[PDB]
Amino acid sequence: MVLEATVLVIDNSEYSRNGDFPRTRFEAQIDSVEFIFQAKRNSNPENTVGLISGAGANPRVLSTFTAEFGKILAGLHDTQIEGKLHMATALQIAQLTLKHRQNKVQHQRIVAFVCSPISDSRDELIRLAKTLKKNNVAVDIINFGEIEQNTELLDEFIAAVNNPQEETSHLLTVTPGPRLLYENIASSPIILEEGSS
Amino acid sequence: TGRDDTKETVYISSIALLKMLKHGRAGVPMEVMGLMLGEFVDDYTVNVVDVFAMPQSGTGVSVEAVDDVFQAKMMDMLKQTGRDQMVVGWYHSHPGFGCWLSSVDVNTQKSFEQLNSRAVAVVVDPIQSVKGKVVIDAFRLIDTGALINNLEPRQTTSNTGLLNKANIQALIHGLNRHYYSLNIDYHKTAKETKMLMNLHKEQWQSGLKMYDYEEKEESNLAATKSMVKIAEQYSKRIEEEKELTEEELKTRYVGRQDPKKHLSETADETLENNIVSVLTAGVNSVAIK
Amino acid sequence: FALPFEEDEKNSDVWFLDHNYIENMNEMCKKINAKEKLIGWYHSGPKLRAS
Amino acid sequence: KAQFQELDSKKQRNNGSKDHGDGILLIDSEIARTYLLKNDLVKARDLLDDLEKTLDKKDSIPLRITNSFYSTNSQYFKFKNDFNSFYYTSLLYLSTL
Fold first, then answer.
1. Where does the VWFA domain start and stop, copy by copy (chain A)?
2. Interchain contact, C19 vs A96, CB within 8 Å
């Protein structure tokens, strides 16, 4: 792919531990965070990824942009397993992280695993929508948590963010069955995806 | 030529003067070093904004002590915060010598000229300064080929210049060889100055506190009793003052060990103190109550 | 030494901090002088907050 | 109490890295409260000392955990008939309730 800066967002809600993916969803996530980091690098090696949590009851910046998985690993193992995803804070935090980098000629991406339905205000969601369009930030959300009993509030906004543009923003929906979580992300486009230009 | 050539007046900001001294004083008696961030404007005006030190991987002032990775890593960091600007020299310390570069440090300066055309080498004296003011001088090294064919005088004109003779003769030879030296000036912001002038914050509380009054009474007794004992000598002193000449008096009758000096001073001390004591206490009762 | 710091005050739960920068810088300073440890961080005012 | 001492070996790798003394603290309180409903003042008495020190070892104890610790203290004091001691435990119990 192209030289890309990504914030990977990990949800540590209390639906992030559902038995849906073996063995537990939380162990499934350890394998996926590692898997995804790697997929991005092998595509084009000029990729970097930072790490922030969107949950724990608090969001926390673990890691800024790095080409070493050892830091990203280290931020992951320090977690507190209960939280609640604050959708709004993750988008903002991610956007500020993307303004400062070691390379400032890179694509601006946010990928977020969403393991719970959102409890966020409706008004709040509308503001971030145009914040992503101002700064020309495109976001793929991997959802397998907000389809379990919830309907996608997020859909409209993610659509809106897309423009003709080498990045395409996408809502990626994953059937939440047993086949393991890194595998469904792999069989979803996320480095098999095409542009909007 | 590309320019008429003259040696830089260095306007070293407050933070950079103060920082080089902290690092280099700590580093006694080792050679210490680091790089200068600044901007070059005019025909001689170098403003040095900050300094940052170069971690010792050698003895200091070596090319084993200048690491490529380190240089790279520091620059990469300074961009995030906007402190990235171009290198206008490098500092070092001799704390065993005045401002005068040694042979090894010329060799370091010869490598810097390749890096930057206007790079200075600034000698910071951490303990060895010979005036009340800090002695620091900046040098630049240009080739022997211009200097010998007599282009050195042209370069040194249309400026006030600086002449020093701190190591006398040794300096002159070195000075000649390198290039020149020029007045060093200091850039002060009036924000910077005000922070520095205030040094206390519980000064307001303290001026309306006092000690226990038991030790005040004690100082007053000690003062009066001590002045009796030098008053006895003081009478004996003015028996003399019978020997012509001020100097002869001091040598012969030991006119220097003066009773006069020790009375005046001790009377002054206890006196000034008791003015303040009454002032503080008398304010305290009526103001507070 | 400076860090980059961005404050968003719409939500006081939205903050920018360069994590990696801190660890890197801590190690370099120790090689000049070992008595330098992380003992805190300054906030630039211009007042105290609850934040 | 015995299971929780084995469990923590396993459990650490699953969570990511977490504490596991949480269950243990609550179990020791329940042993003291069983003793007190059976009138053994002393067995509960050495359990308070050992339990108090472990609160202080952490920077903080949770509200759930500390209610159970203050639960045991209230029970013990009203048997001894110290009004003064009983009073301090109750005002805290309402705060952290």
1. 5-190
2. no
